[PDB]
From a paper:
Long-range gene regulation by the DNA-binding protein [name] is important for stable vertical inheritance and horizontal transmission of the broad-host-range multidrug resistance plasmid [name], as well as for the fitness of its host bacterium. However, in contrast to ParB, [name] also functions as a long-range silencer, repressing the expression of plasmid genes that promote replication and conjugative transfer. We find that [name] binds CTP to form a protein clamp that can entrap and slide along DNA to mediate long-range transcriptional repression, likely by allowing [name] to reach target promoters from distal OB sites.
To determine the mechanism by which [name] induces the [name] closed-clamp conformation, we solved a 2.7 Å resolution structure of a tripartite complex between [name]∆N30∆CTD and [name] bound to its 14 bp OA DNA duplex. The asymmetric unit contains two subunits of [name] that dimerize via the C-terminal β1 strands and α5 helices. The DBDs (helices α1–4) from opposing [name] subunits dock into adjacent major grooves on the OA DNA. The asymmetric unit also contains two subunits of [name]∆N30∆CTD whose opposing NTDs (strands β1–3 and helices α1–4) are self-dimerizing (interface area = ~1,250 Å2), showing that [name]∆N30∆CTD in the tripartite complex has already adopted an NTD-engaged conformation, even though CTPɣS was not added to the crystallization set-up (see Supplementary Information for further structural analysis and discussion). Therefore, we reasoned that [name]–DNA may facilitate or capture [name]∆N30∆CTD in the NTD-engaged state. A network of specific interactions is established at the [name]–[name] interface, including [name] Y84 and [name] F249. ITC data verified observed interactions, showing that [name] (Y84A)24 and [name] (F249A) completely abolished the interaction with [name] (wild type (WT)) and [name] (WT), respectively.
Residue numbers in the entry:
A (entry chain C), B (entry chain D): 2 to 108
C (entry chain B): 51 to 259
D (entry chain A): 52 to 259
Write the structure that this text describes.
Amino acid sequence: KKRLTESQFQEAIQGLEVGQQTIEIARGVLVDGKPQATFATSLGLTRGAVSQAVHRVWAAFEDKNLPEGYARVTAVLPEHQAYIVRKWEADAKKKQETKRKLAAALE
Amino acid sequence: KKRLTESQFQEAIQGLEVGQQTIEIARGVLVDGKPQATFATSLGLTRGAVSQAVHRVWAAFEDKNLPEGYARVTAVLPEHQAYIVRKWEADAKKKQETKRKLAAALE
Amino acid sequence: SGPIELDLDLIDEDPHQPRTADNPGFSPESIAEIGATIKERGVKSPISVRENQEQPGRYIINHGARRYRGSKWAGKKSIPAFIDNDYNEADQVIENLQRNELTPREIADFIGRELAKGKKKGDIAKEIGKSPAFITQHVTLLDLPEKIADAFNTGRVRDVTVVNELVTAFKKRPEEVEAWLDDDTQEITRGTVKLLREFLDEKKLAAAL
Amino acid sequence: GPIELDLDLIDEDPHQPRTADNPGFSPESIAEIGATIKERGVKSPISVRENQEQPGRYIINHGARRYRGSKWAGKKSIPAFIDNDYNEADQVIENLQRNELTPREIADFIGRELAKGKKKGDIAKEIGKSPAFITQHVTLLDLPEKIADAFNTGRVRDVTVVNELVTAFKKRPEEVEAWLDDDTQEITRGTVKLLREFLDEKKLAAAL
DNA sequence: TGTTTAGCTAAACA
DNA sequence: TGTTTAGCTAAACA
């Protein structure tokens, strides 16, 4: 599934505009590994509410987890610009493999 | 505040998964040029519901109005390549705004 | 032991000179700047003139149009010169080429005029002391597809070798090349063109498979 | 007219503003002008001064290339005239009007004049250029390390772009260095322009 | 008067 | 049992 550690979770909700209950639900599920239905039953919410709550935090996490100096972008582009964006991505994932394999080689 | 011709409207709702009321609201506003508050007052909805209804249909239109080869792409890029991809989108949104006002002017 | 001062009023620019009026070295900045140095320090590179056969007492510039204009703007009556009556059009091309004064268009147009005389690329190359390949590259410019032409004239692309690369690409996949050019923000360079070709090859190969 | 001088009585000026690796002094370059000189002769006579410290010999004011190409053609002599009032700035002017000087050559010439206690004002005057032209080339004398690498490996050659890059780097160095550290990144007026736009978009979302 | 976006339901879906 | 997305509100904002 999707699981986080408490520290990973901490970082995801930092400056996220979300209230108590979403945090409670997400920590329950992502961190403590509790099934979403438990919260649905106990807070009297639809299974869809709970799914949405988990999803907010999980997305937040993926956004903060992108290497610094990088960003997700999404767009609708001419074919030619499509190609370029794809070529950029490849060259970028290579440079991160060299950054990763380098940290790993030093420590 | 922006408008569709009958035929542009029809193309936007073609195969769009939305109910009658959204269609009725959108037609009123985008085709018949009636203000959204009319519908809010008459259907007893918040101004935000009606704004959302209009927005669904308007989006649908912009999606169908793209030239061939255009396509949503997602990537994780170095920040400055992200900027360019965003600049590309803007310049492209402008060209589609010119394409729409021209179809409508031929009609 | 010297050149000789000639009155400017007895000197005329050659109207078949290979540089065109829109040459950047004929810009008001260019001429006013050379006027300035001429006023201060004098003309220290004397110009070459021939005697005008059809109009006794008057001269035609072989080389030195710019000094000649700059001399006027500086307010000079005369200009250092010597006479060389054995100076033809190729000599002019050569001297301008040696100074990197000719635009790609100017060179291509000079080559057009020689072709139009029934001369052969071989001998046009010889007469301006350049390679067959130099001639060929510039010949491409004499008959450019419309959009590539616009790009070249508006100066979006200036390097004759990139223009060559563009035309090859456009001969194979024109509508795509035109879309690429129809984007005002697209810089045209060896590298951007390279990306264009890579893109085209990615399409060709989903065209057959 | 001008007068034929023996080549072996002519020496190049060692303070000439073009340096040995100037592209106009390349073997092709000389071979090409040699070729035209063999065929048609030198039709733009060179300027020399009399060598005060070595009677009967001459020093080139302008025409080093014709002089080399005259040798390559196998000539005894070369058309010339004497102008004994021809200084270093006159050389810079002549070379600038022929676009023969590299940005580095111009910067280094400006370095030498500053080192003599001349002021930008007067260096500008004496080569008939603008104070802004002097400033732009001064930037090249002390470039940040990575911008220097780019300039000397010839990734960027245009003095005005190099200036645009340095300005960017003075305000946001880390970012400018990351940009340069990408081997695929073309450096041009336009790419740099996009870089600046990007940086300005970030400063604002720093205050937002 | 219209926009935005966390948060809720419903209900089709796997 | 969890995901998705039209459709709704609230309520700050434009």
